[PDB]
Amino acid sequence: PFNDRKAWAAFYIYKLHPLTYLLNFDVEGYITKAVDCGYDDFAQLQCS
Amino acid sequence: GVTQEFIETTIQKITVDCKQYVCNGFKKCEDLLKEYGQFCSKINQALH
């Protein structure tokens, strides 16, 4: 109602592709950063 | 008298694309090769 009207957020949908990824695992076991191998030449250097 | 001596200073520097050399860009071969660890990265680092 107009008494307690609110503005809600928005969600984004990203398609999943079959890709090679270079995953970095934290000391706690969580992936803190990743590299999209085919995205960039520097990314290809990191993945190779 | 002239004594002739050859002292080599270089070898030909070769970098091998390990993934292409082993698997020729085949997805099944790459999946079967991933079971050997990080062999391609080790080869690349050693040659570099």
Q: DSSP labels for chain A?
A: -TTS----------------EEEEE-TTS-EEEEEETTT-HHHHHHH-
Contacting residues for B5 by C-beta, under 8 A, at least 6 apart: none
Q: Which residues of A touch B41 (CB under 8 A)?
A: 48
Q: How far apart are CA A46 and CA B8, in angstroms?
A: 34
Q: Which residue of A has its CA nearest to B39?
A: A48
CB of A48 less than 8 A from some CB of B: yes
